[PDB]
Amino acid sequence: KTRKESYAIYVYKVLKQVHPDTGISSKAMSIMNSFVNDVFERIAGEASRLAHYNKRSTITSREIQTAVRLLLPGELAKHAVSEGTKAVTKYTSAK
Amino acid sequence: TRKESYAIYVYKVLKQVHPDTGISSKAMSIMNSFVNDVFERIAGEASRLAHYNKRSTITSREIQTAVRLLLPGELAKHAVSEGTKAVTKYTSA
Amino acid sequence: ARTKQ
Amino acid sequence: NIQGITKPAIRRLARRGGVKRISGLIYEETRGVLKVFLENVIRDAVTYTEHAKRKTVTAMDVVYALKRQGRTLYGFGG
Amino acid sequence: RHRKVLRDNIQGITKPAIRRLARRGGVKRISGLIYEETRGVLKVFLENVIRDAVTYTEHAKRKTVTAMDVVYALKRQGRTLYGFGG
Amino acid sequence: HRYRPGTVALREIRRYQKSTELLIRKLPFQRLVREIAQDFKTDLRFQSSAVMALQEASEAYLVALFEDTNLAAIHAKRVTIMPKDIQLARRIRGERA
Amino acid sequence: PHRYRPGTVALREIRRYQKSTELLIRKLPFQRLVREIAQDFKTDLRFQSSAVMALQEASEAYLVALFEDTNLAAIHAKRVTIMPKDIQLARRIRGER
Amino acid sequence: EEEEFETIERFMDCRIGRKGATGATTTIYAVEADGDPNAGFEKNKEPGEIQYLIKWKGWSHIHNTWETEETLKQQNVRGMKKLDNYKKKDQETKRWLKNASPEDVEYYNCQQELTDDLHKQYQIVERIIAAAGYPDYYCKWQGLPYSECSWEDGALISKKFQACIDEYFSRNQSKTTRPRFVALKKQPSYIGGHEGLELRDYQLNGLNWLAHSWCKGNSCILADEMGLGKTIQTISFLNYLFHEHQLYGPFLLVVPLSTLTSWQREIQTWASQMNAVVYLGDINSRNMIRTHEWTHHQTKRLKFNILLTTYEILLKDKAFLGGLNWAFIGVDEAHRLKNDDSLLYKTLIDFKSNHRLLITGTPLQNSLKELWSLLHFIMPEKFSSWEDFEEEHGKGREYGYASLHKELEPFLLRRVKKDVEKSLPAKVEQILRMEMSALQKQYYKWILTRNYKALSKGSKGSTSGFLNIMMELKKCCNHCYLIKPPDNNEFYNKQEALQHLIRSSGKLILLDKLLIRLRERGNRVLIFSQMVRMLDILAEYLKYRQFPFQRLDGSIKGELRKQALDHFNAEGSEDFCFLLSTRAGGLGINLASADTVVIFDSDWNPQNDLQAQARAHRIGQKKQVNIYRLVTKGSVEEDILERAKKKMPFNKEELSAILKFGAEELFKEPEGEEQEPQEMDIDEILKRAETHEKNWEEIIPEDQRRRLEEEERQKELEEIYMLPRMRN
Amino acid sequence: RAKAKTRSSRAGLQFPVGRVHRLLRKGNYAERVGAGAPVYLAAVLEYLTAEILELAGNAARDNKKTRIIPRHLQLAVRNDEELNKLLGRVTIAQGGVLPNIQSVLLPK
Amino acid sequence: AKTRSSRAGLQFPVGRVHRLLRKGNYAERVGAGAPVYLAAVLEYLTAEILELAGNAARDNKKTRIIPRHLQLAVRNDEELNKLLGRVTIAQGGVLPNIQSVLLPK
DNA sequence: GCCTATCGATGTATATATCTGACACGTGCCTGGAGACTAGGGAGTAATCCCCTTGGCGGTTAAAACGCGGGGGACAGCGCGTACGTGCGTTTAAGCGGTGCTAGAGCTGTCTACGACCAATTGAGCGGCCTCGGCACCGGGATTCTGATGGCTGGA
DNA sequence: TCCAGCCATCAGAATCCCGGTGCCGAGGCCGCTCAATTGGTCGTAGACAGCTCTAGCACCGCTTAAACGCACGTACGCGCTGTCCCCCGCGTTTTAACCGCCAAGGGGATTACTCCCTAGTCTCCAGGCACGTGTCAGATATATACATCGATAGGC
């Protein structure tokens, strides 16, 4: 009866990108909606401890990159930082 | 320049519990950091409880329910009684 | 004598 | 009501865990550890329910109860 | 020469130091292969802790690794250390 | 005929490691939750997705605990897990001191 | 000449070092090892005198807990000597990869 | 009294010799007695033995025994475990010595040659510390601290050197330990020594200074310009109160450990009729000093004329050394006393002393507080505070120059090199100003065009902003490879590296002929540069040129650093070059072994240049010193020189104008490539050289900034984009 | 005014930069949220979701299904040693466990 | 009379805790009773630990609470040790505990 | 045979004597806490619709319980030797300190540009509905381990 | 000639796989409404520069506590053997879980009004932090005493 927002539609687009033929059940959506929410609350949680130790008041892409660097293990960090840098460059370079 | 700390207040509590005992410099640093960490735990749990119920204010009820969650069984009962004593006296005075 | 003979 | 965790039920749990042989006293220790684990999680669940001024204990509250102890569970909403 | 500058520095955690740490824990007899395992374990512990401290130092646009950075590196891994700041 | 001791155990290991179904029965575990919540607030009401959220957090905890117990029992050069194996795993994990 | 049997000096060291809170690892070689590992991440790093102090307190406390767990693991196997497999079992139970 | 047997001490010997040796055959006392039963042996000719006999416990090196080593096991001597260590160390020893480079093998051979001589030198006594007189002739050996002093029956030492030692033994019974103006400035060189005639005129005047100062009662700071006046004129002045006046109080000289051997060697060569308690060693050595040599005659009638102690030991035993009313305290390298917070300064102040002398090897130019401290130490009175001093030290006054370092009654000599030296040929600072190479021009253009966005601020810029740019451009005054090294795949080919060197470095074209001309003559070279990385390039370049060379910077350990300096300073040194640094000037090193020096780099402080020249301008040099400085018509140091000469990087407006005037017009002009302004190789520069004793958009060719902004935006975009979306 | 164009489309991402910005500003993480923060955060979230979906689908093809089920995510996460180090404490409902038997227990 | 600590009967700072809650970005609002409640909890927890550490100081026959007097207090109490279980205390040492099987007989 | 007896060390533990450096206390003041006020809106409360939890029932049948045989693993006992401990000896370098230098952490005063707050309007994403294909359930047989039984022959 | 390592064949019981057939759960799709984006402005944060001085790295010399090496021997890890009952596999009787259906009402999720507590800001005054200072507490040395432990000798 009331709008309850979720990451189903965007994760579905990502699935239809990496695997155009596969589908995803209604319960893997709940895992997907929870995984993204958990990673959000972890990275943005660190980006709140950072920019408080430094006495800043704003969360920036640099602090989000530092949170990703601290949080994701091994090779997952490099690709995550690379994808974030690509998105930032494409946003700043175009309208 | 001023590095504010819980140093003055720990001494007052110590002087009330053991009037003759004193406290060393490094043990004060532990007690100062002990206050800060249990401060941050209760505040973070209070923040999340407020967010979970779509609330914007951190109240004595939020702090009480966070203490009941973080502290063990008897420490929770003692802390809640002390907290409810302080708040009830502050509304009267 | 102290020396080694 | 704890003895409704039947002996075969504990056996099946051990098989999933890789246990080949089970001693006859594992069952009571398994029951006590499960009672302790539930007494930890359900206490937090009731604490969240009391704070919300509610009577029905929800999945969101239970996943918060596991989230405070670091057993994050995916599939329900937390 | 009997020794060289060849980054053998982890061997400066000697048999005596590992033995004393075990004796504080309660160990009465120590096998001769415990020391290499302790050295391997200690390097793995330090690598993770030092990396987080270096990440905080780099974020701060700073070049000196501080006690506050080390405490924040330990606080992430659930190993809170009291005594140096907060 | 009769299979020798161990053959059925390994068959059960593979069957229950392949499957994702829950192992503790739903209703006699639901009643145990109701009984533990009895001591904390009376007249409580439980959702199905919160009794099931507790079930899938109980089973996946015993299963990993039982894995640690098996590791500790193989350590002592044994095949059968024992109460002294559960207590050592739970003392090393930090749940008991 | 008077000579203590194997075990007597082991217990006194246990008694002395459990009572004392002094550092066991030598400061200077531990400081050198800290600088070595850090230089793999960022070169030309300076270290405050308290940063190495904080690292050594954490490192020693971690090892002592690890040695307690290792001694308990060895005893579970009905032994008195700690061995590398005990350390491996303790770390695997604790969850370190 | 006596003691028991059966203990080994130490294994420092290895030899090959004939069987059947007994006693101490090769020792001097046994050589006189038996010659040698091993004499005439050859390694292969006779069935001999490879010995490694042992230094024995409770007995000296003079008692070092040689025997058939089978007897050692035959006596069940304790301590045989050191014997097993000797083989393993020796077995490791040959595995390195047989395979090392011949230069290092011969280096180790020299290290052995120093080693056994140091070991042989332990045998010689220095003094017996006076039922036989002072019973059993308690005596010191050379090298060992006082702890190792031991006894002799008078049966082997009585023969070797007791003939002259008795004369020193007799010296024990010899009686030892304000007036008007004195008839100074005579010729007393006969009192100098048994060849004591070498005192020059200026050294004599220094002695005449010191005597005049005490006749006035004043104290002295020996501010000699790091010449020979450090030791020779200092020790001789103490003869004034002893050998002329016999007013011989107790004299203290606190000298650093590095220079103690020199001070102890020249206190005997000059002023030979003196005694000297070297107060070195562990607590046992100093205990032996106090009980046995400190007061021979009776209570508080000291028998030491002079004693030498390090600054390190003076702080440890401050009580015993400070309890005597000193006639003289001497401190060498006294720039350690430049700070009143120093513990040595605070403790040496409290020493009651009749006269005080400080020796320094610097012009002590530092601010008023350093002088105020030094003046306070020599004179504790009438110089106590700024309130009674401001009228005189008040700077900023041209009339004040009549007193600043002029009107100082606690006189310092400050006697410069120019006053003492009277036969040195004239000197000219060679400045080899030249055009820029093509590669340098491109890299110089690369740097400047990169930093346009910072330079646009002008007066609103940052001083630290410019300084980085100027520091970066100075890498273009130095050769290119500090900015971007050459390609390894081509640089490694020595068939092409010679062409690479000569084409890139025009700076060597004239030096090449000088190198050959002076190598045939036998000269040596020292090279100075600020950039340690640029020094690395020189070391690699020198390794390619294969001239022998040394290096001196702050990253070298002490033992290797000292040996490298000693290798170049040794008689007949063969090393040709030396990578030097300015900071070495405070060590008191000697540069007289090399008469040719190249100032490759430039520096912003003329004091560093003075410090480099001061260590080379040694008194007594007969040759004309060869010096060359390099200028490349860019990063103009002459913009500083024209201003500096009125008083010999300070003003924001000036420094911005330096970039606007330096390389004002010869930017990347449309003149094109392959300009190659090389055509002044030889005999052009020699004859024509002089000698002596707009906003940026208006300036820079902004067309390039398009060519950089549109290419850097490409370099720093693929570096973002060149990584896969996904792993694997 | 000009026709609308969502921030997600400018950066190329599929994840909502608008929603991430709102969550970062109505969640009391900091007093200000940079304009470059939601774009970065969505990029990391999109990458992790893509990686997990790729491994889950790769296991789905092995299991012969065409829809991703809970079991495959457990197979995906636990086999990849890096995602397992991120989700070690995580429990996946209906996920099961990795098929593994200790070699000491196998028959001989 | 004009301080919130004196109105609550509290020794810890009500006002400073209010500042840290507001300036720590926990929520958009901090109730007027939250700082009083939190400071009261902070003082009690410190009072308990200080009491146990002073008891250990009296048992060790000293006068000043040093880090091992805090460590001996936290680990002995079953509840404080559970609150501070992951906590490492600098210069704190470990409690004497030798396993029964290692003592000889 | 195994028990327990006094004794010769030799490390803790306990005293009493020095003394140094660190804590509890002092004054000054600057920054922050507080008082008095006004303003918008968050949370309280009453009313309300109905989602869904709970209570009951009755088949079905799957899985639980209980008992029997037998085997294999636990665990006590013994023995053999590789390994750790205790200790004397001795060579390396930690620790202390003194002194020095200069890089880089901290702060202040300035300017700007980047984010929040604001009013509008527009389509991207939510809810409800629908309809087809993947797989859920199922009969079935090709396949694959597995325990019993008949079969060489090694070192002995 | 034998126990045991290495096999062959087989009847039985599994799990696997294929063809088959229903259903319900996804994958689209239509309409809509809340929120995201666009345009403008204001002001406060952070970026930058110019600066001072705390403290980190570095050298060098003493000193001695502690690392390192080796060596005897004694206690413990590790294999092996035996035996004894704890567990497993399984057949069969048995309990109750599961599901489909039924009806009731509890309290969850909202909507809407209103008013009290809380943000923002200004004047205010006093508290707590910083710097200084000095006396005493517990660190150290040394000394005697008091255990704790283990070699050697006699009793039963």
Q: Nearest protein residue to L36's C1' (by CA)? A: I18
Residue closest to H437 by CA, chosen among H599, H219, H302, H633: H633
Q: Residue H132 and residue H207: Cα distance in Å, rounded?
A: 44
Look-up of token digits 């491994």: I55
DSSP state of H424: P
Nearest residue of chain G to residue F90 (CA atoms): G93
Element (H, E) at H596: strand H596-599
User: In this structure, which topology does domain H8-173 adopt according to CATH?
Assistant: OB fold (Dihydrolipoamide Acetyltransferase, E2P) (2.40.50)
Amino acid in the structure at residue H193: G
Q: Which nucleotides of L are covered by protein (CB under 7 A)?
A: 12-15, 25-27, 34-39, 45-46, 48-51, 55-64, 66-71, 73-78, 86-90, 96-98, 106-111, 117-119, 126-130, 137-139, 149-151
Please report, for residues G11, G15, I1, the alpha-carbon distance to residue G2 in angstroms, rounded to integers and kept in the order given. 18, 22, 100
**Residue I93 near residue D76, CB atoms below 8 Å:** yes
The answer to whether J59 and B79 have CB atoms below 8 angstroms apart is no
**What is the nearest nucleotide to D6, using C1' and CA?**
K64
Q: Does residue F47 sit within a domain?
A: yes
User: Does any domain span residue G2?
Assistant: no
Rounded-to-integer distance, Cα H672 and Cα D75, Å: 70
Contact H469, H728 (CB under 8 A): no
Distance CA A19, CA I50 (A): 9
Asked if residue H636 lies in contact with residue H662, where contact means CB atoms within 8 angstroms, the answer is yes
Measured distance CA(E72)–CA(E79) in Å, rounded: 10
H328 beta partners = H251
Query: Is residue G62 domain-resident?
Result: yes
Burial class (CB in 10 A: 0-12, 13-18, 19+), H703: exposed
Instruction: Provide the 10 A C-beta neighbour count for residue J80.
Output: 21
For chain A residues 53-92, those near strand L by a CB cutoff of 7 A are: 56-58
Phi-psi map region of H143: left, alpha, beta (phi>0 left; psi -120 to 50 alpha)? left
Task: Identify all chain E residues contacting B26, using CB atoms and an 8 Å cutoff.
Answer: 83
Chain breaks in chain J (C to N over 2.5 A) after: none
For chain F residues 14-73, those near strand L by a CB cutoff of 7 A are 15, 25-28, 43, 45
Instruction: Supply the CATH number for residue G79's domain.
Output: 1.10.20.10
Q: Where are the domains of chain H?
A: 8-173, 189-420, 430-701
| Total Cβ atoms within 10 A of residue E43 | 15
DSSP string, chain G: ---PPTTHHHHHHHHHHHH--S--S-HHHHHHHHHHHHHTTSSS-EE-HHHHHHHHHHHHHHHHHHHHHHHHHHHHTT-SEE-HHHHHHHHHHHT--
The DSSP call for residue D9 is: H
Query: Does H touch J (3+ CB pairs < 8 Å)?
Result: no
Domain chopping of chain B, boundaries:
1-92
CA dihedral sign, ordered I43, I47, I50, I56: negative
Q: Cα(B22)–Cα(J66) distance, rounded to whole angstroms?
A: 9
> Cα torsion for F87, F89, F90, F93, to the nearest 10°?
160
Resolution (A): 3.2
What are chain D's domains?
A: 1-78 (1.10.20.10)
As a whole number of angstroms, the distance between CA J88 and CA E74 comes to 10
Alpha-carbon distance I69 to nearest alpha carbon in chain A (angstroms): 6
For the four alpha carbons of H377, H378, H383 and H389, in that order, the dihedral sign comes to negative
Q: How many CB atoms lie within 10 A of CB H354?
A: 18
Which 8-state DSSP code applies to residue H305?
Answer: S
Cα–Cα dist H433/H684, whole Å = 12
Write down the domain spans for chain J. Answer: 3-88
CA torsion, points H412, H418, H422, H423, in degrees to nearest 10?
140
- Residue of H118, D73, G30 whose CA lies nearest to E49: G30
Q: What is the CB neighbour count within 10 angstroms for residue D29?
A: 20
Show Cβ contacts of residue H526 under 8 Å, excluding neighbours closer than 6 positions: H577, H578, H580, H591, H594, H596, H597, H598, H616
Question: What CATH architecture applies to the domain J3-88?
Answer: Orthogonal Bundle (1.10)
Distance in angstroms (rounded) separating the CA atoms of residues H255 and H338: 16
Residues of J with CB under 8 A from a CB of G: 67-68, 71, 88, 90-99, 101-104
J2 burial (CB, 10 Å; 0-12 / 13-18 / 19+) is exposed
CA distance J70 to J49: 7
Looking at domain B1-92, its CATH architecture is Orthogonal Bundle (1.10)
- Check CB contact of D33 with chain F, cutoff 8 Å: yes
Torsion region of I39: left, alpha or beta (phi above 0 gives left; psi -120 to 50 gives alpha): alpha
* Pairing state between β D73-74 and J64-65: unpaired
| Residues making up chain E, counted from first to last | 86
Q: Which residue has the tokens 């562990």?
A: H282
Cβ(H236)–Cβ(H199) below 8 Å: yes
Domain H189-420 fold: Rossmann fold (3.40.50)
The span from the CA of H64 to the CA of J47, in Å, is 74
* Identity of the residue in G8, G15, G21 whose CB atom sits nearest the CB atom of J68: G21
Mutation for E interface: G5, G9, G14, most E CBs within 10 A? G14
Q: Which residues of A touch E59 (CB under 8 A)?
A: 50, 54, 62-63, 66
Provide the residue range defining the domain that includes F58. Answer: 7-92
Q: How many CB atoms lie within 10 A of CB H693?
A: 6
> Whole-angstrom Cα distance, residue H626 to residue H596?
5
Interface residue of G70, G72, G76, G94 to substitute, partner F, most F CBs within 10 Å: G76
CATH 1.10.20.10 fits A1-93, yes or no: yes
Q: Nearest 5°: phi and psi at F80?
A: -100, 130
Nearest to F72 by CA among G92, G66, E38, D11: G92
Amino acid at position H203, single letter: Q
Region I6-91: CATH code = 1.10.20.10
Q: How far is the CA of H310 from the C1' of L66 (A)?
A: 28
Top CATH class of H430-701 equals alpha beta
Rg (CA), chain J: 19
Q: Could you tell me if H373 and H338 are in contact, meaning their C-beta atoms sit under 8 angstroms apart?
A: yes
SS3 H511: helix
Strand partners, H10: H55
CB neighbour list of residue I87: distance below 8 Å, 6 or more residues apart: I77
Mutation for F interface: I75, I105, I106, most F CBs within 10 A:
I105
Task: Write the single-letter amino acid at H649.
Answer: P
Query: In the PDB record, what is the listed experimental method?
Result: cryo-EM
- G32-to-A89, E5, E65, G46, H347 alpha-carbon distances in Å: 41, 12, 14, 12, 35
